[PDB]
Each structure stands twice: as structure tokens, then as C-alpha cells.
Design a protein around this ligand. Structure first.
Ligand code: PRP
Ligand code: PRP
Ligand code: FA0
Ligand code: FA0
Ligand code: FA0
Ligand code: FA0
Ligand code: MG
Ligand code: MG
Ligand code: MG
Ligand code: MG
Lengths: 347, 349
């Protein structure tokens, strides 16, 4: 009837789902600086061990978005796409989402990407972008301009979600992954309706998918069956395909499209300078396992985009793979990155 | 190794028992002021939802005890007993543990009682003792003197465990019961080897028993089947009997000894002043439900004390009840409270 920490924490430690509105109450306390770090941590942990539901995580993400800096009215195309994951997969890979995102934009799909620096890897998508000379410090107006002028824009989470600072501090202090690790990908401030969304935690991917389902997004939530928060080339992947308010879970195998099985070590990354070099290599046309993984993920995002103004599954994949490879082979992706760097320098 | 929060918290969220030493490392961070409040709360919650083991809780309590103020050497009798519970049973009662402790002491069993103010109740043992004029603020030397000159001493937890203050603050901030609620009963700084220990939560009583078993204490861990963290008179109780380093679970029925079934409402308490009046009535010999409950719990403690030197179960109880009754009816219990109060008043001058 009246919410409070003991009531909500007690319900969670009792292994019970929250009543409607309780998760939202907790999140709003956290976003307004009213929650003690101890209360934030207890909530994050207790929700994780109970097993959060889509409705609960929908409340968390929705409260968080309510405090975000939005983009200006009518600056995001109806069919814009995001490509991003939770991170936290524990494998030091090159920046597959960030590379796929450039390829997708170069293929002519508008991209508004959310992301952040590394949390447990050597270089995150934002670190790599920065090393490439792309501006990761742009606010709402300049991101809208990047999107209009370059066909791609990057929303740096800390710049768009300043009120999340209390929760983010607690995440860093406790270290262990929680339900909070789901929130970045769920809270793109430009609110695109399509996306390729990676989840490192197989048990929570269905929940992320359920959240997108209630937004009527066209999304592929993906988890490599080797643990990657990306579509993998080393084995199969699980995909939770979200459209028209529902979810269609399936096992995806890239060998069906003629991809050779790679080993994880072939996808290995390093620091920002190293991963930036790996981007240039791929966009320059270097063949091999890294390109293969980039093309696979880029095609996945194109399939998500196709889901908006809606091709069937297989033909969409065939076309996504054609467009992704062509965006690299024709130099369009290399050219678009150069254009993105110039845009940032002309500010 | 090497231990860290991500490692230990990750193991707990994966629903795994900790490795040997991890709980102790976490408690060391907590007790030295090196744990952030977020880390303390994450640990408390994660350990609770995983379900703590007796080994894990034993590590927490042992580290905690290593930072406590000890009583001076050779001041605690070999056969000293505690009577105390977790609290948090959410039933408004008179202070049954504190009353029983006075009666037990007056029966000639040395009592070194650990306790604290109310957390959720209207008056805790410490609050009620304060209302009776008993000094709750004494350090190790004076508690030892109290035990010698009066036959009972009270260890006020915040006085003896100052390094637990960061953990205590987090407990209050989150409000929800955790594994940390088990620590008061497990960390009596006088380390008596026998006790009557109340549990508000049946699911964790076995863990509490296990920690006492590892110490080879003689203890009855108790939970009333009506929810009380005391031996109840309204219905049966569950007892985990700790003896000879092992635990066994029992259902206990006070009707077997001639106790009438009381109603929970008959044991209702009030503020410290009211609960102090209830202590006085019982020690003056008033008959009824409150006396019955005190006598039962006092006998329980005397049974635990007896277990320090092998007495069958039923005779032990018979003698326990008789001893508790006599301590009241001879005037000894009322006289002991008076001596205790007098002792505290002697401290000035
Ligand atoms: O350090 P970690 O916790 O494992 O996270 C690695 C990266 O994954 C996420 O973004 P994104 O998917 O955009 O990065 P990517 O290009 O490396 O896939 C996250 O924002 C990090 O930047
Ligand atoms: O407010 P609560 O969280 O419910 O706890 C009630 C009381 O019970 C415990 O002590 P003890 O068993 O010594 O007190 P008692 O005499 O009241 O039984 C605790 O130290 C509190 O003083
Ligand atoms: N304020 C933030 C918002 C995010 F989405 C992620 C991190 C932070 C931060 O303050 O570190
Ligand atoms: N993992 C993330 C993904 C995003 F898109 C934005 C922020 C984060 C983060 O975890 O801080
Ligand atoms: N310091 C303490 C020790 C205890 F055992 C219980 C509570 C406190 C406190 O600081 O409140
Ligand atoms: N419940 C307790 C029992 C004790 F003996 C000491 C401290 C407490 C407490 O919960 O602070
Ligand atoms: Mg990624
Ligand atoms: Mg990744
Ligand atoms: Mg008690
Ligand atoms: Mg009680």
C-alpha cells in the first residue's frame, strides 16, 4: 500500500515477484539520489537472486528513460537501429557491435547507437570509437546532427543518463553482475524501434526480449552459445526474435549461410589502440574470422530493421548478409567512418 | 585466492556455498571499516538468499569475536549461561529472555547476558533493564565485577562490539532480516559455553545450532511454533538440542509439564516502563501466563546449563522448572534484581 525499502527487499528475499509499481518506486528513489548505497545494492542483488521478470525490468528501464536527456523532437528516423550488448561476457574480443554498427550505417540503415566505456574488458565500444577519432562526448543536438549528416550517431550513456550515477557507482563497488547490467541496452535515449541486442547472461535474455516486446520494437536479442553477447561464429547462437509484441525463440547456426567455424582466440582483442587497428583492418577489406563476425552481426541488425516495415526470416538474412558484405567491399564503411571523424572535427 | 567482492558475491549469486575462508575475508573487510556500505549490503543479502551454512556463519562470528572487547582473564565461570534471541519475531511480548535470565541467575546459575536495545519491538531487553534502573553501559571490568558480586552481568552489544558499527548501520538502512541477524546470539563477548538461544526464523535455527555445535557448547536453540523467538506457552516449540558437538531437532510440548495453553495476547508488552512493571510483577510472585512463560524459559536455560555435565531429558526439565519456581517463590529473584540495581548505583562513589 505504501512502498518502502523493508517491504520491497523483504518481498524479494522471500523469493516473491514484486507488486506492480514497486520496482518503479525503487528505481525512482535511486534516480533522484534518495536511495542509500546500501539500499541500492540490496535491491540490485535481491532482484537478481529472485529472478527478475519482464514487467519488473520494464519498470526499471522506463523510470530510467524518464530521467534521460532525450534527442530533439523529430530528429530520429522511424526506422533507426541500435547495435549494443550488456558486455560482461568475460572474453576479450574485438568490438563487434561497434564495427557492425558502422557497417550497418554504411549499408544505408540509420543507426543511433548507445554505449559506454569498458567495465570489465580491455576496450569498450566507446573507448575504441574515441581511439578512432570519433567524438563520444556529444549531447542531444549534436547527436541528432551526426545522425542527419552522417547516418550514424553515438549516445554515450553517462552523458545521457546523469541521474543513473548513484546506481553506476554501486555497480562498480560490488562488481558482481546484477539485473542492473541489463539496463544500458534497454535505455537508448533516442529510443530506436529496432535493434540487435547482445546479452552475456543466457538466463536473462528472455527477460530483455520481454521488455522489448512490450514496446513493439523489432529486435533480435542474441546470445552466442559460447557465451558471447554477440552472434558468434564459433558455434550456434540463441536468438530471441521480438516483433509485433511477441517473442519467437530459436537456435541460429551460421554454417547454414556457409560460414566456417572459428575459434574464440581468433576474435581476441586488446587495448583501444589495438581494437581501433582491428576496425581499420576490417573496414579496409581484410578477410578472416573478424570480418566474418562483423558481417554476421551487421546482417543481424539489418534483419531487425527489416522487421519494422516488414521479408521473411531466411530471405531477410540473405539480403542482410549481401548488404553488410557490400558495405565493406565497396569501401562504403571505410568512407563512412572517415566522414564520421570529419564531422566531429568540424564542430 | 586472492579473495575479492566480485569473486565472493558472484559465488553467492550463483547459489554456491563459499570456499573455506571467504566469509572470514568478507567479515574482516567489514570489521576493519574497509567494506563500502554497498559491499556490506550486497554480501548480507546474497548470503541470506543463497542460505548460509554453519561453517560460513562460524567464520563471520569468529572474526567478529576477535574484534570484541573481552572480559578480564578468569572472571567468567566455566558454567556461565546466556539467555538471548535474535529478536524480530514481530509479536509484541514482554521481555521473556531478560526475565528468565534474572530467574536463572537467582537459581544459582551464573548468567552473562548479551543483548541490545529494541530494533523493531516496543522495548528490548536493554531498554527494559534500563527502565528497572540496571546500568546497561558497563565495560568489561565492571561486567566481570557484576557477575562476581551479583551473579549476573549484562554485555551491551554496541559497547562490546564497536567495530560492528558499519555493519549495524547497513542492517538498519535495509531493514530486511539477513544472516547478520544471527550474529548477536553468536557473539556474546564473555563466551559462555551454555545458552538458551531464541530464533525468530525457523529456516535458520539449524545453522545457529551448528555454529554452537562446532564450539561444543551446551545449547537449546528455540523457536515457538507460534512464531516466538522464545519457548512458547501458546503451543508447541521446536528445539534444536546441541550436545556433545552434535545437533538434534525436537518438538517440545509444555502441556507435558502441566502448562495450560495461553493466548499470544496474554504475553503482550508495551513500552520500557510497562515492561519494567511486568518484570516486577513476575518477581513479586504474581501467578499467570507471564510467570508461566518466564518459568518455562528459565527452566530451558537451566537444562542447557545441566548439559555441560551429562541428567536425562525429562528429569532435567523437572528440576529446571522446580528451580525456576523456587527462585521466584523464595524471593531470591526479586532480591537478585535489587542487588543488581544496587551494584550499578554503587559505581558512582
Ligand atoms: O567491458 P564489458 O563489460 O565486457 O563491455 C564491453 C562493451 O560491450 C558493451 O558495448 P558494445 O556492445 O557497444 O561494445 P562492442 O563494440 O565491444 O561489442 C559495453 O557498453 C562495453 O562498451
Ligand atoms: O526488537 P526486536 O528486533 O524484536 O528484538 C527484541 C529483543 O530481543 C533480543 O534480546 P532479548 O532476547 O534479550 O530480549 P527479550 O528479554 O526481549 O527476550 C534483542 O536484543 C532485543 O532486545
Ligand atoms: N551516469 C552513468 C550513466 C550510465 F548509463 C552509466 C554510467 C554512469 C556513471 O556515472 O558511471
Ligand atoms: N552495457 C551498456 C550498454 C549501453 F548501450 C549503454 C550503457 C551500458 C553500460 O553498461 O554502462
Ligand atoms: N556497534 C554495534 C554493535 C552491535 F553488536 C549492534 C549494534 C551496533 C551499533 O553500532 O548500532
Ligand atoms: N539480537 C541481539 C542479541 C544480542 F545478544 C546482541 C545483539 C543483538 C542485535 O541484534 O543487535
Ligand atoms: Mg557488443
Ligand atoms: Mg561483446
Ligand atoms: Mg528474547
Ligand atoms: Mg522475544
Amino acid at each position: 500500500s505504501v512502498p518502502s525499502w523493508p517491504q520491497i527487499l523483504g518481498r524479494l528475499t522471500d523469493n516473491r515477484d514484486l507488486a506492480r509499481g514497486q520496482a518503479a518506486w525503487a528505481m525512482d528513489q535511486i534516480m533522484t539520489g534518495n536511495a542509500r548505497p546500501a539500499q541500492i545494492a540490496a535491491f540490485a542483488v535481491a532482484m537478481t537472486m529472485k529472478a527478475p521478470t519482464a514487467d519488473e525490468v520494464g519498470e526499471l528501464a522506463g523510470v530510467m528513460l524518464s530521467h534521460a536527456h532525450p534527442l530533439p523532437a523529430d530528429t530520429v528516423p522511424d526506422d533507426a537501429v541500435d547495435v549494443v550488448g550488456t558486455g560482461g561476457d568475460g572474453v576479450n574480443t574485438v568490438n563487434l557491435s561497434t564495427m557492425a554498427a558502422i557497417v550497418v550505417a554504411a549499408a544505408g540503415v540509420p543507426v543511433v547507437k548507445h554505449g559506454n566505456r569498458a567495465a570489465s574488458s580491455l576496450s569498450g565500444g566507446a573507448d575504441t570509437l574515441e581511439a578512432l577519432g570519433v567524438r563520444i562526448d556529444l549531447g542531444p543536438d549534436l547527436v541528432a546532427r551526426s545522425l542527419a549528416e552522417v547516418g550514424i550517431g553515438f549516445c554515450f550513456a553517462p552523458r545521457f543518463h546523469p541521474s543513473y550515477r548513484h546506481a553506476a557507482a554501486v555497480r562498480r563497488e560490488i562488481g558482481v553482475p546484477t539485473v542492473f547490467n541489463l539496463l544500458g541496452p534497454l535505455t537508448n535515449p533516442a529510443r530506436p524501434r529496432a535493434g540487435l541486442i547482445g546479452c552475456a547472461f543466457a538466463d536473462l535474455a528472455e527477460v530483455m526480449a520481454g521488455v522489448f516486446a512490450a514496446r513493439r520494437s523489432s529486435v533480435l536479442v542474441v546470445h552466442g552459445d559460447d557465451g558471447l553477447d554477440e552472434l558468434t561464429t564459433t558455434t550456434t547462437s540463441t536468438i530471441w526474435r521480438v516483433a509485433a509484441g511477441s517473442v519467437d525463440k530459436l537456435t541460429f547456426d551460421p554454417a547454414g549461410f556457409g560460414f566456417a567455424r572459428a575459434q574464440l582466440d581468433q576474435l581476441a582483442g586488446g587495448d583501444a589502440q589495438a581494437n581501433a587497428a582491428a576496425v581499420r583492418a576490417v573496414l579496409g577489406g581484410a578477410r578472416g574470422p573478424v570480418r566474418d563476425a562483423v558481417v554476421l552481426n551487421a546482417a543481424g541488425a539489418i534483419v531487425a530493421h527489416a522487421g519494422l516495415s516488414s521479408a521473411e526470416w531466411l530471405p531477410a538474412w540473405e539480403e542482410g548478409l549481401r548488404r553488410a558484405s557490400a558495405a565493406i567491399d565497396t569501401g562504403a564503411a571505410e568512407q563512412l567512418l572517415a566522414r564520421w571523424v570529419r564531422f566531429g572535427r568540424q564542430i
